[PDB]
Symmetry: D2
Subunit: 115 residues, 4 copies
């Protein structure tokens, strides 16, 4: 995959499963244009978002939907999304994995960029 997203639930110690992930690319008018979307697997992973061709240099926002994810724990999070922004491909084509460890009022995200 040119772009993979992996989401972990840092409260329960488990993959974040079936969580909506929307990816955007900064457009000509400075707004965020919808780029790719999916839901995380049983493993907290979202593969197949994009193709090498579609995935040109630019600024991308990964939006993880955290709104009702910790409803059952009875806490409303700091925000309805966990967002990670990265600047891409900005020296030829590379594979990205965006790994996010999520808690309601914290998060740790790491971009692993390969090739």
């Amino acid at each position: 995959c040119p772009l993979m997203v992996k989401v972990l639930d840092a409260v329960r110690g488990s993959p974040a499963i079936n969580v909506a992930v929307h990816v955007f690319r900064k457009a000509a008018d400075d707004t965020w244009e919808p780029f790719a979307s999916g839901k995380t697997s049983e493993s907290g992973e979202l593969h197949g978002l994009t193709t090498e061709e579609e995935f040109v240099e630019g600024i991308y926002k990964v939006e993880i939907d955290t709104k009702s994810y910790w409803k059952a724990l009875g806490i409303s999070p700091m925000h309805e999304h966990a967002e990670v922004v990265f600047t891409a491909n900005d020296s030829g084509p590379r594979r990205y994995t965006i790994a996010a460890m999520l808690s309601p009022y914290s998060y740790s995200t790491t971009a692993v960029v390969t090739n």
Copy 2:
């Protein structure tokens, strides 16, 4: 302060000093409206961003300048900013400390929300 931003450099183990920070509030047309800015102190802190009356309910983005911060380490970071989005107040006044532990390809960020 109604809003304080604290920035640590996780690579060198030191406050991130003289780092530019921009705060935005989500406006009616879905643009980010400039809200406050400044540079971090010797302790990595940015105090005095806003007043309790100016700190109205809304969605806020904190944008920490990272572009050339690790230039001396010879590393280009994942993005020119580290960004944190939070949804504010909703319940009477609250004070927010946004704490960010930064490396070129990872960051951890926590919103501490009190009274």
Copy 3:
């Protein structure tokens, strides 16, 4: 302070208050010798642990009690402590701040070392 410990609750977005912190130093027999202890303040901070003289070079472990800290959330954590080990003082006095942002199955720690 020569050594300060600050603990944040990353699930609720608040300082972790009145949490027991024990500090140990690696002894002659490779065991952990009790060094200092206290409880975090209302700000999640623990000051006054040690003195510049007592705080010699060596290997130190900060043990944060997390056993029953999230009991009210109904999750048992990955372990009864959050532990940070650091190697100290290679030169003369350094002041350490150990910042720990804690979730039941994740934690981010950072050591800020200042001269």
Copy 4:
């Protein structure tokens, strides 16, 4: 695997490759008994540490060797290891992935515990 360790280099945005990892299990005299070891793969992963039956209930320490890992950056880290302690395998069998995002003066670790 009953136990997998995955290590990422948060400074360079890469897997931490060929990094030594030591696992210990807490023994009755309060000593850490060596349990398993190895070095991370090209993906930053260390698989094959243990078997379901060897991975008995107990307290485990994972020790990732960081001493010289950022030597090329010219930084000496906060400690010669990044360490994670976890209390294991209550409630029948569970598989653990210990995921560590490392920088010289910070790390984020997560235990992902699943029931197979």
